[PDB]
Design a protein around this ligand. Structure first.
Ligand SMILES: Nc1nc2c(ncn2[C@@H]2O[C@H](COP(=O)(O)OP(=O)(O)OP(=O)(O)O)[C@@H](O)[C@H]2O)c(=O)[nH]1
Ligand SMILES: O=C(O)C(=O)CS(=O)(=O)O
Ligand SMILES: [Mn+2]
Ligand SMILES: [Mn+2]
Ligand SMILES: [Mn+2]
Length: 620
């Protein structure tokens, strides 16, 4: 009802019907339309026709360019201030801070940023009133997970950015059929705005609307709401991905007895016709997509990709840990991708793919650092800054965090069970990061509790995916430091509690380091497709082969248990060397970090593993 005509937004709907929406969905749309004051409302149906119109629109507005060399590929260039996740402006709102982070002993917490509800209410009111003036509010109904899967969750994202709509069509399962599956069920509420109401006060850089000063990505798990403002980029704007499927979902998983993790899922088949699935948690920019899509060098071996970034996992009735990939595409780092490093990615991204912040070649192609592919005479390069670029400048032609956004079904090695609603059974979990020194190529944990400790102890040198710089080794437990939805101490107790379940078939836990360097500063291990030799060892250990020897840090391959044939002069001594001096400093750094950062919420089993490791190292 109403006394005037201010609350019914039906006359502004340019696609779809407010009447056809489930009542709670309609309330969510109209209430925020009243707040944000969009000029039009577009209820997405996910059709090819709609997608063509969005692309055509964005091209007419100068937001994207067609890459004529390929089949239905497009390039978007952003404001150079809006190029990555912003960890420092990502907050979680709970009534009590201890729900979100452990209360640190003395330092500031690194395991999340908590914000009180009263403080958020002020931040929200300073940002969202009137923020979509003159723009279209797009209503994106999307499913994380196969539309019907038991672990599948549905969200509605409101946004004023057609770039978000187009990317969400690739990255999620999106459109009318999700609304039918939803009915009057629960959904995650996602509100996004680039924060540039019209008329524009500030002209735009690269036609890219954003509000860096006011950027805020907020999560309200008790209300099942994600609210994001000011950034159009990646993990800030595609709210189904990091915000929903890791942060909100890890809290739900704690509540409901499952796991939401920053992990790839791959299936690997050996020359004897046996196939196993492994999950791997590496931090951002540490190689998950390269491993998930690997072209193995070992003959008779095959790798198939289930997902490259997010895994949702749960024990089934039989005690198997089952994982699904909740995403519908890959949002992968472009620089360093080449026929040599990731050939299966090259095959995937040549059609139906949106590129963000890579270079354009004058003949309609893409360029980036490490593409390892020479151009023809007369071909010129336009950098991601929309400038002429010669390899004589100091700056790269593509932003280091530039991305492709591509449908998963196009991957030539996509696993046949990647959409199976029952998931794939996980038999091994891999942890790892960038460690230039000290940490061997691969080791295996001694027990479930030791393996949880290994995940908790993860460290990695700083990358270009958050907003960090310098040559610093930082802690990134479980590769989840930017993504915890709740208290990390309780997250550890959650993982440890999996060993208490009956008939639980606990996977083996490994740690890898592709990144160890010699005194020269050059890598000791060739990596990429050669990592299949490490997976072969893991495969045999899962089958029970007697191929390991005991060290103070866990099991390492026996000499000659690794197929090194063809690599030639690999320094096995340095790749698997374990120095007492290095590990005495390492355990101290882990001790200081867990004492300060997890404090009273640190499970005793984790402290016991820290003590045991300290003792094994002292006896060296
Ligand atoms: N030296 C070396 N570098 C690697 C290897 N695998 C991947 N990389 C490098 O790591 C960078 C990032 O790898 P990705 O696979 O895109 O990282 P990701 O873990 O999927 O990161 P997110 O999508 O941000 O979560 C690439 O540019 C690669 O060059 C490897 O085996 N050895
Ligand atoms: O940062 C990461 O791990 C990503 O996968 C990219 S974004 O989705 O966070 O932008
Ligand atoms: Mn216009
Ligand atoms: Mn990631
Ligand atoms: Mn990736």
């Amino acid at each position: 009802p109403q006394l005037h005509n201010g609350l019914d937004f039906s006359a502004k709907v340019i696609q779809g019907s407010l009447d056809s929406l489930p009542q709670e969905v309609r309330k969510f749309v109209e209430g925020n339309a009243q707040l944000c004051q969009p000029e039009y409302i577009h209820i997405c149906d996910g059709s090819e026709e709609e997608y063509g119109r969005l692309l055509a629109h964005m091209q007419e507005e100068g937001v994207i360019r067609k890459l004529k060399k390929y089949d239905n590929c497009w390039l978007a260039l952003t404001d150079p201030r809006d190029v990555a996740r912003i960890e420092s402006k990502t907050v979680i709102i709970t009534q009590e801070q201890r729900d979100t982070v452990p209360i640190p002993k003395s330092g500031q917490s690194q395991l999340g940023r908590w914000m009180s509800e009263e403080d958020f209410e002020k931040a929200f009111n300073a940002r969202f009133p009137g923020c979509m003036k003159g723009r279209t509010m797009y209503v994106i109904p999307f499913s994380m997970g196969p539309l019907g899967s038991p672990l599948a969750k549905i969200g509605i994202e409101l946004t004023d950015s057609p770039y978000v709509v187009a990317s969400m069509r690739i990255m999620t399962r999106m459109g009318t059929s999700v609304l039918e599956a939803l009915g009057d069920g629960e959904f995650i509420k996602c509100l996004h705005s680039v924060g540039c109401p019209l008329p524009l006060k500030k002209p735009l850089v690269n036609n890219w609307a954003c509000n860096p000063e006011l950027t805020l990505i907020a999560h309200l798990p008790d209300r099942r709401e994600i609210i994001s403002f000011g950034s159009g980029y990646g993990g800030n704007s595609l709210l189904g991905k990091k915000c929903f499927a890791l942060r909100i979902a890890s809290r739900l998983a704690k509540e409901e007895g499952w796991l939401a993790e920053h992990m790839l899922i791959l299936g690997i088949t050996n020359p004897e016709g046996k196939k196993k699935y492994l999950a791997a948690a590496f931090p951002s920019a540490c190689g998950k997509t390269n491993l998930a899509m690997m072209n193995p060098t070992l003959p008779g071996w095959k790798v198939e990709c289930v997902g490259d970034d997010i895994a949702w996992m749960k024990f089934d009735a039989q005690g198997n840990l089952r994982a699904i990939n909740p995403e519908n595409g890959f949002f992968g780092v472009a620089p360093g991708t080449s026929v040599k490093t990731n050939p299966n990615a090259i095959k995937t991204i040549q059609k139906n793919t949106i590129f963000t912040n890579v270079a354009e070649t004058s003949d309609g192609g893409v360029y980036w650092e490490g593409i390892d592919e020479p151009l023809a005479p007369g071909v010129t390069i336009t950098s991601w800054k929309n400038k002429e670029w010669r390899p004589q400048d100091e700056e790269p032609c593509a932003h280091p965090n530039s991305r492709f956004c591509t449908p998963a079904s196009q991957c030539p090695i996509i696993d046949p069970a990647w959409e199976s609603p029952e998931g794939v059974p996980i038999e091994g979990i891999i942890f790892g990061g960038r460690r230039p020194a000290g940490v061997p190529l691969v080791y295996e944990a001694l027990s479930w509790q030791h393996g949880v400790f290994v995940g908790a102890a993860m460290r990695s040198e700083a990358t270009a995916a958050a907003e960090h710089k310098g040559k610093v080794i930082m802690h990134d437990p479980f590769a989840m430091r930017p993504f915890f939805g709740y208290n990390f101490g309780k997250y550890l107790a959650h993982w440890l509690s999996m060993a208490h379940r009956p008939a639980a078939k606990l996977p083996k836990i490994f740690h890898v380091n592709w990144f160890r360097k010699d005194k020269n500063g050059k890598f000791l291990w060739p990596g990429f497709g050669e990592n299949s030799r490490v997976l072969e060892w893991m495969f045999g250990r899962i089958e029970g082969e007697d191929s390991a020897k005991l060290t103070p840090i866990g099991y390492v391959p026996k000499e000659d248990a690794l197929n090194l044939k063809g690599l030639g002069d690999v320094n096995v001594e340095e790749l698997f060397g374990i120095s007492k001096e290095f590990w005495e400093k390492e355990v101290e750094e882990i001790d200081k970090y867990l004492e300060d950062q997890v404090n009273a919420d640190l499970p005793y089993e984790i402290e016991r593993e820290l003590r045991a490791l300290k003792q094994r190292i002292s006896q060296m």
